[PDB]
């Protein structure tokens, strides 16, 4: 019997958002005590494993069900988030093991948020499909319109991926398996300066259909670092 993921990994600065009927959020403290369920468990290879059904609960700020970590700079206050200035880096390794009928899940994000804690658009969405990961960077801070697409081909269902998502002074650097692509989001829209951000990682299942089944994503490592210095890449 393996330890729960919040024992194996440092989840002191994450909460877990679930696809149960109530769209429950497990606090960092409860992750640390060893929370585990059908949605979130340690597999035999040790991976922190996220399962979400397409029939799951959905929240006001999410189009689809999720079993997904949400970064908590302050483990007891979701209104504490980071800015466009400085260097903000998430590194992970993982794989997607099962897809919903739509064939598409989101496995990491940077999400915008207002100072008051209210929703703002997603900034980066790491969209996995069998054969390609697309690290979508939103153009407008309004949340209207489309994404800058960044295609990483050759990543199959079951393949190990290594990912880094970095913001350095309003520039997004998106990296899959050593291939780095940049989008100057602040340069494109100064409105991004008026938002704050948080990282996410897990399984945000891009299928809400009755017959869509479920998805499984795994992480083998997950780390976040923040500094108001200027580390480009």
Describe the structure.
By secondary structure, the chain is mainly β. The chain has a single domain, classed as Sandwich (Jelly Rolls), CATH 2.60.120. It has three helices and 16 strands. It has helices spanning 5-8, 28-33, 185-188; strands at 14-17, 25-26, 40-42, 48-53, 66-71, 87-98, 104-113, 119-129, 131-138, 147-148, 151-155, 161-168, 171-176, 179-184, 196-205, 214-227. Strand 12 (161-168) and strand 13 form a beta hairpin. The longest helix is centred in the N-terminal third of the chain and has 6 residues, at 28-33. It starts with a helix and ends in a 6-residue tail after the last strand. Residues 9-226 form the Alginate lyase domain. Keywords: Lyase. This is Alginate lyase.
């Amino acid at each position: 019997p393996a330890a729960a993921p919040g024992k194996n990994f440092d989840l002191s600065h994450w909460k877990l958002q679930l696809p149960d009927a109530n769209t429950t959020e497990i606090s960092s403290a409860n992750l640390g005590l060893g929370y585990t369920s059908q949605y979130f468990y340690t597999d035999t290879d040790g991976a922190m494993t996220f399962w979400a059904p397409t029939t799951g609960g959905t929240t006001a700020n999410s189009s689809y069900p999720r079993s997904e970590l949400r970064e908590m700079l302050d483990p007891s206050n979701s209104k504490v988030n980071w800015g466009w200035q400085g260097t903000h880096t998430m590194k992970l390794s993982g794989k997607t093991v099962q897809l919903p009928s739509s064939g598409k899940i989101i496995v990491a994000q940077i999400h915008g948020i207002m100072d008051d804690g209210t929703n703002a658009p997603p900034l980066v969405k790491a969209v996995f499909q069998d054969g390609q990961l697309d690290m979508q960077v939103k153009q407008n801070s309004d949340g209207t319109g489309s994404d800058v697409h960044n295609y990483f081909t050759g990543i199959k269902l079951g393949d190990l991926y290594n990912m880094e998502i970095r913001v350095t002074d309003g520039v997004a650097y998106v990296t899959m398996n050593g291939d780095t692509r940049s989008v100057d989001f602040v340069g494109k829209d100064a409105g991004w300066k008026n938002l704050k951000y948080y990282f996410k990682a897990g399984n945000y299942v891009q299928d809400n259909t009755s017959t869509g089944g479920s998805a499984i994503a795994k992480l083998y490592s997950l780390s976040v670092s923040h500094s108001n210095l200027e580390h480009h890449h």
